[model samples]
Target chain A: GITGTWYNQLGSTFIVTAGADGALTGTYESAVGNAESRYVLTGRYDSAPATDGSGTALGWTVAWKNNYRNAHSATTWSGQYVGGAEARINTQWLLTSGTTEANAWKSTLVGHDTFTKVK
Target chain B: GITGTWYNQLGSTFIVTAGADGALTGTYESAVGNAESRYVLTGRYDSAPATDGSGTALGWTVAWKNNYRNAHSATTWSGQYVGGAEARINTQWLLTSGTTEANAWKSTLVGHDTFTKVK
Candidate 1:
C-alpha cells in the first residue's frame, strides 16, 4: 500500500552541511505540512585488512519518518546484520501512516529499494 | 557460515498487493513448478550520521525461499555491485533432470554487507 505525497513542495531544497570534521545537518519543509518526512540511516566502510580503503563491512540503521495529513510522526526502524559479498544493500521499505478519522490512515511504499554502490 | 535445507517444498508465502501496484506474482509452491528456490535475507543495521537517528543506516533486503535435497538441477553462479555500497550475489545449484545425485552446491559470503551511508 502506497500513499501520501510531496515532502516540502517539489522544488523545496534543504541545505545539507558537511565538513572535513564529518559534521552534517539539513532540513526540508512541507506545504501541506505533510511533507516533512525523511530517511535517517547509518552505514560504514571497512578499515580493516585496511586496503587503502577496503576491508569488512556492516549494514545500516534506517529511521524512516512517515508523515500523514494534518499530523506527522517519526519512527526509528532498526536492522542488524553483517558479512556478505561486496557491499550490497538487501534492505527495502514501504512505509505507512494512519490519519484522518482519528484512526484513518494513509500508506506509501513503492516497494523495497534494490541498491548497489559503485566506488 | 550458516546452513539449512529446503527447495521444492517448505512452508513459505509470497504476495504483493499495492496501489499503482508493482507487478509481482506467483507463490513459492505455485512458481516452483520446476525448481529455483527462494531466500529471505536477515540483515544487520548500519547506522550513519553515527549518532541520534542521524546519517544513513545499513539495512537488509532478504529473500529466503528454501534449502533442499530434492536434487533438481543447477550448479554454479556469481555476480557484483557498483558504488554506494556495491554488492554481488551468486548461487550454485547442483542437480540435473532425473539425476538425483545428492544435490550439493556451494555458497560464499562473509561480512559481505559492510556499508557506508552519510553525506
Candidate 2:
C-alpha cells in the first residue's frame, strides 16, 4: 500500500516500491539542505492489513552513508498509512549519526512530517 | 526539554535525559512480545527553537542488539514536542533490522505513537 512518490511538508521527497511481502525499497531526496543528492530508503509494512480505521503500521530508513570522516546520518521514519482522498502517512522521523552507538545521540535529530502520495 | 519518562500507545516506555546541546540519552522498555528488556535510546532535539506554533523537533533510537544470529532491530522515533496540558511527542517509529544496508527493509517495521511525559 506504500508504493508511490510521497511528498512532505518540509518539501522532502520519497519514492517507494512495496513488494508483495511488505518489503519497501525507495530513494529519498531531502529538502532541508543539499537537496541535490538522493539516498536509499527502505522498510516494511503489513502488506495485507485490517481496516479498523486506525491505519496500517509502517517504517523506513534513509542511508546517508557518512561515518569516520564525517558524521553522516541514517534517518528512519515510522508512521501509519491511510488511503483515500486523504491518503497519507503521518510520521515521525529520526536522524542518527556517528561512528558507533556509544554516543549515537551526539549528532542525532528528530522531527515529524506528514507525507501524501503524489503518483 | 525532553528529559523525562515517556509512555506511548503501545505501552512502550522510554526514559530520557536531554543535555544543553540537545543530545538525548535514554532507555526504552518495549511492551510488545518478549517484553522484558530495556534498550539504549538516544537522539537529539532542538535545544533552542522557534515558537511559531510548529513545536520543537526531536528524535531518538533504541538499539536491540541482534545480528548474525538473530534479526534484532534498532527503533528510532522522530517527532515534534508540544508543552502544556497536551504536552506530548507525536511520533513515527521505524524499526529496521538485518545484516547490511542491502535490502534492509527485509526485517523492517514501521508504526506511530504519541508519547506523553510520565514524570
Candidate 3:
C-alpha cells in the first residue's frame, strides 16, 4: 500500500517504491536550517489483519544510512490507508553511530508523519 | 511472551528480561572455538495475532553490540508459543558498521533458534 511518493508537513519527503512481496526501497530527504540530509532506505512492509477493530494496518521497518554524515537510522512505522489519498503514519526514528552505546540510544526521535500521497 | 532465558543448539544463549510494555533488556553469549563473545541487547517485542492462520505469534526486534569485538548486530525474530515451554523462532541477523554501505549489507546472517523458555 505504501508504494508512492509522500510528503509531510515538516517538509521532509519520502519516495517509497514497494514490491508485491513487501520489499521496499526508498529515498528520504529533509532539511533544517542550511543543512539538508538525504538517505537511502531499504526494508520490508507487512499488512496484518485488523487486531484493534480498525480495518487493516500497515507495518514497516526501514534501515537507512547517510555515510556522508556518519549517520545510521532505523525507523518503524505503523499506519492505515485513508481512502486513497493519505496514510496516517506513526513513526519512530532512532539514530545510531559507531560510537558509545550511550550515545547510540540517546538519539531516538519520535514523531508522526501523516503522509499525503503525491503520486 | 519472551520473558525468560533461552538457548540454542549452537550453544548460544539469550537471557531476556522483558517488561509489561514489551521493553526488553537482555544479554547474549556465544562461543566459537576459544573465542567467546558477549552482547548487551535492548529492544521491544509485541504479540500480534496470527497472520498466517496458525495461531498467535510473538514478534521481536533487538539491537546489540559487542564492544570488545567492534561488532554491532540487529536481530528480528518471529515465533509461536508451542504449548508454554517452547517457542520456534525464525531469526535473521544483520551486522553493520560505520563503514561502506556494501559492507554493511554484506554481513547479514540468518538462522533459527527454537528457544526453550526457562524461568
Candidate 4:
C-alpha cells in the first residue's frame, strides 16, 4: 500500500512504486526550493508486521543533487504506514548537507513529517 | 510482499502483480488437468493491520474458464501473510464448479494452502 503519490505537511510531494519484494523507488518533489525540484530516491517497504502490532516499515532516501548551493546533501526518511479511517505515514527524516568539517554539522537538520496518500 | 510467484502443495502455482492501490491481477496455474492451464485472477492485499495486530490481509479469486468439460468453476483464497525465519501465507480456499443444483455441491472443495515465495 506504500505505492502511489503522497503529500506531506510541509507541502512537499512525492510518489512511490512498490516492489514485490518490498523495494521502493520514487522522486522527491522538494517544497523548500533550496535544491533541485526533483531528486533521485530509493528505499524499502516491508509489509510484515510485528507480533506486538506495529507493521509496514517504510524508508527512503533522496539525494539532493544539483543544489543551488552546490553542496552535498541528502534526506532520509524512516517511518511506519498506519491505516484506519485515514491512512498515514509518520516519519522522522534527517537532512544533511556539506562536509564533516566546519559548517557541515551545523548544516544538518532533523524533523518529522506525516504523509497521506494524495488519492 | 505478497507479490511475485508462489507455489503451494498439489503442484498448484500462482503469479501476482501488485497495484499501488492494492488491487491485484494474476494468473493461476492449475494442477488439475481438467481445466485450462492458466486461469484469470483478481484480488486484494491490505497492508495495514488491525490494532489487535491481525495484520496484512490477503485474498484472491480465480475464475476457471475454458475448461475441457466447459464447466463453470472458480476458486477463492483468503489468508494472511506472516513473516519470520520462513515467510509464508496460510490460506483457506474454496473451489466450486458447475451449478448450485445437481453435482455442483459435490464438485465444491474446501482446503488450505500455505504459500511461500519461489526460491
The best-first sequence of candidates by TM-score reads 2, 4, 3, 1
List where candidate 2 sits over 4 angstroms from the true fold: A32-36, A66-71, A99-105, B1-119
What ordering of candidates by lDDT runs from best to worst?
Answer: 2, 4, 3, 1
**lDDT score, candidate 3:** 0.43
- For each of the candidates, what fraction of the native contacts does it recover? 0.03, 0.06, 0.00, 0.00
Comparing 3 and 4 on lDDT, the stronger one: 4
lDDT tens digits, residues B21-74, model 4? 545567778776334586656555543333332324455655454333222444
DockQ list for all candidates: 0.03, 0.06, 0.03, 0.02
Query: Judged by DockQ relative to the true structure, which candidate is superior, 2 or 4?
Result: 2
What is each predicted model's overall lDDT from 0 to 1? Answer: 0.22, 0.60, 0.43, 0.57
Scored by TM against the true chain B, the candidates give 0.20, 0.81, 0.61, 0.79
Score residue A58 of candidate 3 by CA lDDT: 35
Residue lDDT tens for model 2, B5-111? 88887787888887774566666776752435665455656555544444555666554532211123346676656675757876666665422323423544666
Candidate with better lDDT, 1 vs 3: 3
lDDT of 2 by residue, A1-119 (tens): 57888999878888889777556667777774353466556565555444434455566655453221112345667665667576887666666543222342354566777898763
Candidate 1 lDDT by residue in tens digits, A16-60: 232222112233232232445433322221112112222122222
